[PDB]
């Protein structure tokens, strides 16, 4: 149909016809609040390929985050430690801006479940994202068997644990020789497994 056309058009987001739209939308989002409700997704194909369906119970939020690395909260830039830990200025957060956006959205709305998110616009001082939320207690979602997994209490606050697509990347999961950090589960699980002394009964 047309979603392939929209995808191949959004792929080349450096041409003039797309750059003008991105700049206008960034300017428009700069005047709104840091967190608000978009009544319809700006990227319908991107929302569909993430799991958004045009039916009751699915909400779209637009949220902006501050672009740039994080700074140490130490007073006056003093850490009172060895010189290796004197890095107050140039530090980078382990999680992505998209992930912290999903986290802020899920924290603002606890009654909803963060499914996924995507990028809409950005500039020098801000970066904008659109997140998708599911209502786990709506009858139009609880009755559909394909979306009953979002209702179970195990998926409560998926954004605060890195279960989303943005947090899964920052977690470091994967299969291969490049992901020996976290073999099973988390890197902390791998650490606990590889740094425990196995004392059998007969040794």
């Amino acid at each position: 149909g047309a979603y392939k056309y929209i995808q191949e058009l959004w792929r080349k987001k450096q041409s003039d016809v797309m750059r003008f739209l991105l700049r206008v939308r960034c300017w428009q989002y700069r005047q709104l609040s840091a967190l608000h409700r978009a009544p319809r997704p700006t990227r319908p194909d991107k929302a569909r390929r993430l799991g958004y369906k045009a039916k009751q119970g699915y909400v779209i939020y637009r949220i902006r985050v501050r672009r740039g690395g994080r700074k140490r909260p130490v007073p006056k830039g003093a850490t009172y430690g060895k010189p290796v830990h004197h890095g107050v200025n140039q530090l980078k957060f382990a999680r992505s801006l998209q992930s912290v956006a999903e986290e802020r959205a899920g924290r603002h709305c606890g009654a909803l479940r963060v499914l996924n998110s995507y990028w809409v616009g950005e500039d020098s001082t801000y970066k904008f994202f659109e997140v998708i939320l599911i209502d786990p207690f709506h009858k139009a979602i609880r009755r559909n068997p394909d979306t009953q997994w979002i209702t179970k209490p195990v998926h409560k606050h998926r954004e605060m644990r890195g279960l989303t697509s943005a947090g899964r990347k920052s977690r470091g999961l994967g299969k291969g020789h490049k992901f020996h950090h976290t073999i099973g589960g988390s890197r902390r699980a791998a650490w606990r497994r590889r740094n425990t002394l196995q004392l059998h009964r007969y040794r």
């Binding site: 392939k4 056309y5 191949e8 058009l9 080349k12 450096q14 041409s15 003039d16 016809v17 797309m18």
Partner: protein, 98 residues
């Protein structure tokens, strides 16, 4: 004479499988419909700034400089070769015609 563990032809001798390869290996092939939609969106969007700069460089006999510029813009050299080929093709397709 005898199969050896080392040499130009090592290992236990077996017969090859003439079975058809799996269809996942066939991915992102040049499709008529995909080529059509890509060429239709290309003429709508135009070109990128660096693409236009590289086309201007190709218009002049300076080609190694354009190759270096593309290699500095995009990541690797093998991508730069294909980008240079595509830019030369789009420059020679319609601009050479009346």
């Amino acid at each position: 004479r005898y199969p050896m563990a080392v040499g130009l032809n090592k290992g236990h001798k077996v017969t090859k499988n003439v079975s058809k390869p799996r269809h996942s290996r066939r991915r992102s092939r040049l499709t008529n419909h995909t080529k059509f939609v890509r060429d239709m969106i290309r003429e709508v969007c135009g070109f990128a700034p660096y693409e236009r700069r590289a086309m201007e460089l190709l218009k002049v006999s300076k080609s190694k400089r354009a190759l270096k510029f593309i290699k500095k813009r995009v990541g690797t050299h093998i991508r730069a070769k294909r980008k240079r080929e595509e830019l030369s093709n789009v420059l020679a397709a319609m601009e050479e015609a009346a």
